[PDB]
Every structure is written in structure tokens, then in C-alpha cells.
Design a protein around this nucleic acid. Structure first.
Ligand SMILES: Nc1ncnc2c1ncn2[C@@H]1O[C@H](COP(=O)(O)OP(=O)(O)O)[C@@H](O)[C@H]1O
Ligand code: ALF
Ligand SMILES: [Mg+2]
Ligand SMILES: [Zn+2]
Lengths: 171, 656
RNA sequence: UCAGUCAGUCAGUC
RNA sequence: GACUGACUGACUGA
């Protein structure tokens, strides 16, 4: 009911990463893709959505390596890594096959699955849910940033052919 | 002691425990050093009471020598056998004749053994009773390993006891082979060189060898060159201006050199410029007017070449480095003021473009991207970064130190002992300090070639090659640095030719690992017969294959420096001149640039070219010279030729 | 067959 | 720590 469909923007796309015409598929290119040089570009294999959010839930499927999904806002610096600077709250799948959460630049460790983000700044509540065959509960915390928040993603860029896409389930 | 030998390690020693000269081949990361230890321990215990046996271990690179020496010392400390080492670093070494006899296990760097053999302090190689070579692949051509083996073979074929010979290698190499037959040709010739008889490789226990040893994956990164570069445009225009000035004064510049279709950024252009230097320098006239011509051509060519070197350095490093190179040359270093103005005319534009970040060198940007992603993936990793030349080591060190993006990295250096072209490398305690530090705070190593052939820095998860290529032997040794499992190698380059070369090298490696499986099926005595044939033939070939007052002028201003009949070599290496006239033919700098002793410089204020330096011998300090700075002209005839090193030139040498 | 860069190694004088 | 000499291999090019 409160579900929305965020759409990747070409605004922040990283050179290495690539996007599809439908603008709901994000993958890693086989070769670098030229793009305009600006301080806006991440310079790291990450991406930021454009649906500015100031009751929003969205589901990203992680089937088809290492992925980070989260929420960050426009203040975040491009060169810093997603989830490790202050403004950004993310869930990452480490390289040691463990699932960890980075909130308020604090490490917090905790089997993978397709995951969502559910945010309501109306009470300053941020929640993740890993939904596959069952409504499993993942790490949930409290965090409020003054600026409106954007969905965000990080996809391991050295290994071609891993893609992350967005699923708009319906009531 | 606590090490428990693995199965294949026991398998790889039997052919050598039996006493046959052998060659041991296994992938990188196998326990070759441990295997050598087992062979040596079993060979040492065999001798009966009253007779003891010496073992020798060679190793051609100093860091490798220290690592191997330490391993041997620790292992045989308990048993009580006494190990030692002789190298170039040892100072006022006690007589080698005595040190060899005192100690049982001797670790050398082979050029020492060749020195002593030729001098006559060690009479005959019969003293030793085991030789171990840590790169069997180097024994060929005229490498010092092969000169030791030449002496050995000459002793055996003609007409005492002769020592066993082992070799360890991870890749025997294919030489110039194009098909499997040529590979077999080369491999058999290698085996013949060191009196081989058996090649031993893991066959029975291959299943285990796969689980413990990990083959790192390989990847290729091709980088787009810049769409448009301002630095290249400006410097090339300057080069063309200088080239036109060069064109004017001499009637013909193109004829002097056959090289054609020159491009500004290549090495071909460097060859052209140098050949033009060395051709103009020999132009002669029938005799003061041409001095201006020679001086002018010297200056135009020199500055042209220096701009060329700037362009190359700019290609492989950050632009600031090239600008620094040029600025330093002009600071240090008539026509000169003309070209000084011509550079200062544009210098502000170069400074502007240097600091605009959007023109950052794309290769270095890719290096930053790859390092950042890899270190983000696994926070605990250690990287080795291989670079061709020594200048690039310092450039990359600066780049890592002051880049905001790559904070995690904490670099270290590693180069070779010798000091060359105004850069001086590490000393042995420094190398030991770096390597033991990796055992720590450092997280990335910057190496030249010396860190191949087994540095054994465990827990490496990333090898990065910065336009590094070579014959397949080098590829295997370089890709094998990453001892830790999960490791990767990235070949990072901009030229498509290099990307092609690495693919053909991988194919060559597959061909080699086939042509060494083939050679294991022959009978056990056909090998010995054909090896003896090759040895004898090559011995015949090698044995029979061997059996005044010229004026010296200045390379730049052509003034009568000295005469050959007034140069007396001192102690057979330093060269010096005598006489009051020569003391008037140069003017020592009152405060020399290094200061750290005074240099020499041409007497005239017109010309200031590096004649030599001043050094102190016993009571009296003498002036020494470098032949690179003179031109020889015959006393009667007018002939002129250029000698890069003293050895080519032949005069009536007379001791001091 | 001749050239030019590069990287390793040894010797001698301070 | 910096000075001068030799040795070897690899990569280019003509
Ligand atoms: N029996 C063993 N058990 C565990 N590790 C071993 C054993 N033998 C050797 N190694 C490890 O293998 C490493 C690499 O061996 P090394 O001889 O350097 O390979 P290479 O053939 O490249 O020289 C050594 O540092 C050693 O620590
Ligand atoms: F002997 Al190795 F890597 F081949 F140390
Ligand atoms: Mg080894
Ligand atoms: Zn002069």
C-alpha cells in the first residue's frame, strides 16, 4: 500500500557500472562506459536513486556475489565508501560470506536473501526485511537525517556480470 | 622441526636421494625449499664417521639470499651443522679459502664462486659434494651459473671426484620455440647444460597438490588513452620549434639517420636524437667556426631529447612529475638563454593544466579504482605492485602518500642494492627490515624486477602489473607471488600489443607443460646418450671459439683537453692525468653541485660539461675523468670516433 | 651483424 | 653515506 517504485538516475552512475533502458536494471559493464566528468559522479562502483524521500518501502532482489543496499542522502561525499560515512545507512554482504550492517559509522555483524528497505522518518524508524520463502526479520534501527533521503546501492565492480534489480511487488 | 612433510614433498626427493643429478619441477608455492632441506639433511647423514661433506647453495638476488640463508640456519641449528654465507655485502672477508673449509654449508652468490675459481684461491671444484641451484632456469648463455657448470663439465669430459648437482625450478621455459618440437629441443639443451639426468615432477600425488596449492586467477585491464591532452600539445609544439632551429644551422639533418616516420612520444624518436648527436659530433671542418655549429647542435639536440623524456615520463606517471623533471633540468642544466625564454614563455600554462584534476592520467585513475574496490571487499589484504623502472617507484610512492582517496594504503619500497642514475637503493639491513615488517603496519609493496623468483611474502591477495611483460618464465614467477589463496593478478595496460602478448604467453605455458610431460616417457639411457652428445658438441664449439698520442677534445666545444700518452691508470680502474697544463684546462666549481667532493668542468666560460670528479688517493688527491665526455682525434689523420666506456679505446696504458 | 634504454651482480678508492 | 670501474640477462628498433 505504501510501496513505491524508485528509479535509478543517470545522475550519479559510476563509470564502471551500467544501467538498462527500462531504468530498473543495474549491472556491471564488461568495459568502462564513458560519462561526463563532474564531482557528482561517485568514482566508485555505486549508484544513487532519484526519488527524493522526505511511509516508503521498496524491495530489491539480490539473487544474481557481494552487494550493499541502503539509504543515503545528497550530502554524502562521492569519494567516501557507501555505509562508512556518517550520513549513510546500509546493509552489506561482506566478502567472508557474512551479512553485516553499517549504521552511524559503526560495525555491527549478524544466510542471504532478497531484501527490502522500509523507512518512515515520521517516527525516525529504519527497517530491513529479508523476504524469501518467509518474512524473515533483519537488522532494524533508528536514524534521522534532516535532509530527505534517497535509496542507494553498491555492486562489486571488479567482477563483470553481476546485476541488481528492483522488484515492484503489488498488493 | 614442527613441519610435517606433505606427501608430494616426499615424492619429489627420491630421485635425488638416490644420488642422480636432478631437476625438480613443481608449481610456484610448492615446498621446493623444504625439499632442498630434506635432500641436504639426508645427504649429510650418509657420510661415515671421519668424512664430512660440504653443501653449497646459490641464489642470485640479495633478498632471496637472505631469506634462504635464514631458513637454512634455523633448520640446521639443532643438529649442529654449521652454516654460513659469503656475499658482496661482507666487509674485509676472512680468506674465502679458509672460510669454505671451516664451515660445512656455504651459501654464496655465484659470482663469488666464479671470482675465486678464476683467481685460484679455490683450486678445484672437487671440494664440494653437493650443489643446489635455486633457479635452474637461469643456467644458460653466459650467466654465472653456467660458468660454474662450464668448469664442472670441462673437468668431467676431459680425462677426481665430482659433486652431485641439483636444481629447483617452477618453469623451465621454451626459449624461441614455435611448436612442441622446438620446446623439446630447448628443454633437452637445458638438461644438458647442468649435467642433468632426471626431471622429477609430481605425478602420483597430484590430487593432494591441487588442494594445498592455489593457482591465482588472471585478469586483463585495457585503459583508454585520453581524448585530448593539453600537456602533450604544448610540449610537442615546443619540440617542433626546436627542431626547426636545428634544421636551419646544418645543411642536412634527415640524412644523418636512417630512422624514419618518427613519432614524438616513442622510443624510436629517442634513437633518432641520439644518433643525430653522435653523427653531428664527428663533423669536421678545415677550424674555429664549426665550434659554434657543434655547440649549437649539442644544445638543440640535448633539449629536444629532454623534452622527449618528459613526454614519456608523463605517459607513465602523473603530469606533475613530468613538469618537475623539466623544471629541475632547466634549473640545473646565448642559445641557452633563447631556449630558456622559450620554455619560461609557456611555463605558467603548464602549471595551470597540471593542477586541473580532470586531466588526471587515466591509468593511475584505474589503479585507484581497482585498489579501492579490492580493499573495500576484504579489509585485510596485502598487495604487490610491479613496475618496470626505479624512477616509477618513487613516483608511485609519492602518489600513494598524498592521495586523499587511498587512505588505507601504507606503502613500502623494495629495490636492489646498486645505485644508478641519481637514485640509490636499499641496503641489506633495509631490505631485511622491510621484509620482516611484512611478517606489522605496511600493506602494499612497490617493487622492481628484483622481487621475482621467490620473495615468499605470505598472505598476498593481489599482484598488480604496471605494464610489466616478458618471456613466459617471468610471467610464471610474477603471477606466483600471491602465496595466499583467493589471490588474483591484474595486468594493467594501455597498449593493445601488451594485452595480446600476455595471451600468447599463456598459450606458450600450456605448450611447455605439455612438452615436459612428453619427455618423461623416454627410456632411461637414451637420455644419457643424447645428453652426452650435446655436452661434447657444445664443448668443442666453445673451446675452439676463442683464442699513438691521440688528442682528446671536448664533446661540446672541441678544445684540446689532453693526450693519451699522459694518462696513467691508477690501481687499474681509476684514470688520471698529470701536468700543469691539464690543471689549467678545467676550472673546478668553487662550491660543487653535490656539495660530496668537487666536480670538474670545462675551462671556458662558454662550455661547462662534466669532465669528471676529484678523488683522494693516499697522500695526493688526483683528478679523474670520464671518457664519455671527450672525442678522440688522431695525432696525424683527422679521424674521430666516440667511446662510451674506457674498455673499447686502446692506448699505451702505463701504471701510475 | 650493429645500435639505445632498463634491471640485477661483483671489484677498488674514500 | 657518495665515488669510479668492469659482468650478465631481458625488452625494443633499424
Ligand atoms: N610442510 C609444510 N607445511 C606447511 N607449509 C609449508 C611446508 N613446507 C613449506 N611450506 C610453506 O611454503 C612456502 C613457500 O615455499 P617456497 O619454497 O618459497 O616455494 P617456492 O617453490 O616458490 O620457493 C614456505 O614459506 C613455507 O612456509
Ligand atoms: F623457488 Al620459488 F617461487 F619458484 F621460491
Ligand atoms: Mg623458491
Ligand atoms: Zn668544453
Amino acid at each position: 500500500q505504501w510501496a513505491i517504485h524508485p528509479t535509478f538516475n543517470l545522475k550519479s552512475l559510476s563509470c564502471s557500472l551500467e544501467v538498462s533502458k527500462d531504468s530498473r536494471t543495474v549491472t556491471v559493464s564488461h568495459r568502462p562506459q564513458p560519462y561526463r566528468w563532474s564531482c557528482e559522479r561517485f568514482s566508485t562502483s555505486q549508484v544513487l536513486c532519484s526519488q527524493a524521500l522526505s511511509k516508503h518501502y521498496w524491495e530489491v532482489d539480490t539473487r544474481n556475489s557481494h552487494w550493499a543496499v541502503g539509504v543515503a542522502s545528497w550530502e554524502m561525499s562521492r569519494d567516501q565508501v557507501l555505509g562508512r560515512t556518517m550520513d549513510s545507512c546500509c546493509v552489506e554482504w561482506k566478502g567472508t560470506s557474512q551479512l553485516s550492517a553499517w549504521h552511524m559509522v559503526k560495525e555491527t555483524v549478524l544466510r542471504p536473501g532478497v531484501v527490502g528497505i522500509w523507512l518512515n522518518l515520521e517516527e525516525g524508524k529504519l527497517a530491513f526485511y529479508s523476504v524469501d520463502n518467509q518474512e524473515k526479520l533483519l537488522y532494524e534501527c533508528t536514524i534521522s537525517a534532516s535532509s530527505p533521503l534517497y535509496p542507494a546501492f553498491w555492486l562489486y565492480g571488479l567482477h563483470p556480470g553481476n546485476y541488481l534489480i528492483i522488484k515492484q511487488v503489488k498488493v | 622441526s614442527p613441519f610435517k612433510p606433505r606427501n608430494y614433498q616426499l615424492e619429489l626427493a627420491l630421485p635425488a636421494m638416490k644420488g642422480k643429478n636432478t631437476i625438480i619441477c613443481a608449481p610456484t608455492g610448492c615446498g621446493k625449499t623444504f625439499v632442498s632441506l630434506l635432500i641436504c639433511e639426508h645427504h649429510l647423514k650418509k657420510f661415515p664417521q671421519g668424512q664430512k661433506g660440504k653443501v653449497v647453495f646459490f641464489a642470485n638476488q640479495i633478498p632471496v639470499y637472505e631469506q634462504q640463508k635464514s631458513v637454512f640456519s634455523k633448520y640446521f641449528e639443532r643438529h649442529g651443522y654449521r652454516v654460513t654465507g659469503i656475499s658482496g655485502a661482507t666487509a674485509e672477508n676472512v680468506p674465502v679459502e679458509q672460510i669454505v673449509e671451516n664451515n660445512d654449508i656455504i651459501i654464496l652468490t655465484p659470482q663469488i664462486l666464479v671470482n675465486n675459481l678464476k683467481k685460484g684461491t679455490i683450486p678445484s671444484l672437487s671440494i664440494f659434494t653437493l650443489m643446489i641451484f635455486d633457479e635452474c632456469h637461469n643456467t644458460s648463455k653466459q650467466h654465472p651459473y653456467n660458468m660454474i657448470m662450464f668448469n664442472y663439465l670441462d673437468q668431467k669430459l676431459g680425462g677426481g671426484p665430482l659433486p652431485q648437482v641439483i636444481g629447483l625450478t617452477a618453469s623451465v621455459g621454451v626459449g624461441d620455440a614455435k611448436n612442441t618440437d622446438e620446446a623439446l629441443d630447448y628443454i633437452c639443451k637445458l638438461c644438458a647444460s647442468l649435467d642433468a639426468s632426471v626431471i622429477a615432477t609430481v605425478k602420483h600425488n597430484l590430487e593432494e597438490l591441487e588442494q594445498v596449492v592455489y593457482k591465482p586467477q588472471k585478469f586483463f585491464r585495457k585503459v583508454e588513452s585520453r581524448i585530448s591532452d593539453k600537456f602533450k600539445y604544448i610540449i610537442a609544439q615546443l619540440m617542433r620549434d626546436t627542431e626547426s632551429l636545428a634544421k636551419r644551422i646544418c645543411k642536412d639533418l634527415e640524412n644523418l639517420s636512417q630512422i624514419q616516420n618518427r613519432e614524438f612520444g616513442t622510443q624510436k624518436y629517442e634513437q633518432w636524437i641520439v644518433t643525430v648527436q653522435k653523427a653531428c659530433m664527428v663533423f669536421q671542418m678545415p677550424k674555429d667556426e664549426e665550434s659554434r655549429i657543434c655547440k649549437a647542435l649539442f644544445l638543440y639536440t640535448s633539449h629536444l631529447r629532454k623534452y622527449n623524456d618528459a613526454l614519456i615520463i608523463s605517459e607513465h606517471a602523473r603530469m606533475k612529475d613530468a613538469l618537475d623533471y623539466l623544471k629541475d633540468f632547466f634549473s640545473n642544466v646565448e642559445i641557452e638563454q633563447d631556449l630558456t625564454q622559450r620554455f619560461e614563455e609557456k611555463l605558467q600554462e603548464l602549471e595551470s593544466v597540471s593542477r586541473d584534476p580532470s586531466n588526471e592520467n587515466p591509468k593511475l585513475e584505474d589503479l585507484c579504482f581497482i585498489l579501492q574496490e579490492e580493499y573495500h571487499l576484504n579489509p585485510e589484504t596485502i598487495t604487490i605492485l610491479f613496475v618496470k623502472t626505479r624512477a616509477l617507484v618513487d613516483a608511485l610512492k609519492n602518489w600513494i602518500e598524498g592521495n586523499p582517496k587511498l587512505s588505507f594504503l601504507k606503502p613500502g619500497i623494495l629495490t636492489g642494492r646498486g645505485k644508478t642514475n641519481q637514485n640509490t637503493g636499499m641496503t641489506l639491513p633495509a631490505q631485511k627490515c622491510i621484509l620482516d615488517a611484512f611478517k606489522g603496519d605496511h600493506n602494499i609493496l612497490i617493487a622492481t624486477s628484483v622481487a621475482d623468483e621467490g620473495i615468499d611474502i605470505a598472505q598476498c591477495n593481489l599482484v598488480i602489473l604496471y605494464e610489466y611483460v616478458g618471456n613466459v618464465i617471468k610471467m610464471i614467477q610474477t603471477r606466483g607471488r600471491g602465496r595466499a589463496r583467493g589471490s588474483k593478478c591484474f595486468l594493467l595496460t594501455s597498449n593493445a600489443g601488451v594485452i595480446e602478448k600476455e595471451q600468447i604467453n599463456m598459450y606458450k605455458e600450456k605448450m611447455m607443460n605439455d612438452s615436459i610431460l612428453r619427455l618423461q616417457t623416454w627410456d632411461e639411457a637414451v637420455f644419457r646418450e643424447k645428453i652426452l652428445h650435446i655436452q661434447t658438441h657444445e664443448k668443442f664449439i666453445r673451446d675452439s671459439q676463442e683464442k699513438e698520442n691521440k688528442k682528446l677534445l671536448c664533446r661540446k666545444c672541441k678544445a684540446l683537453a689532453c693526450y693519451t700518452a699522459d694518462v696513467r691508470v691508477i690501481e687499474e680502474c681509476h684514470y688520471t692525468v698529470l701536468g700543469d697544463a691539464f690543471k689549467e684546462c678545467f676550472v673546478s666549481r668553487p662550491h660543487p653541485k653535490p656539495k660530496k667532493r668537487a666536480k670538474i668542468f670545462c675551462a671556458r666560460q662558454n662550455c661547462s660539461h662534466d669532465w669528471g670528479i676529484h678523488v683522494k688517493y693516499k697522500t695526493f688527491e688526483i683528478p679523474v675523468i670520464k671518457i664519455e665526455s671527450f672525442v678522440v682525434e688522431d695525432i696525424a689523420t683527422g679521424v674521430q670516433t666516440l667511446y662510451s666506456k674506457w674498455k673499447d679505446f686502446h692506448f699505451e696504458k702505463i701504471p701510475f
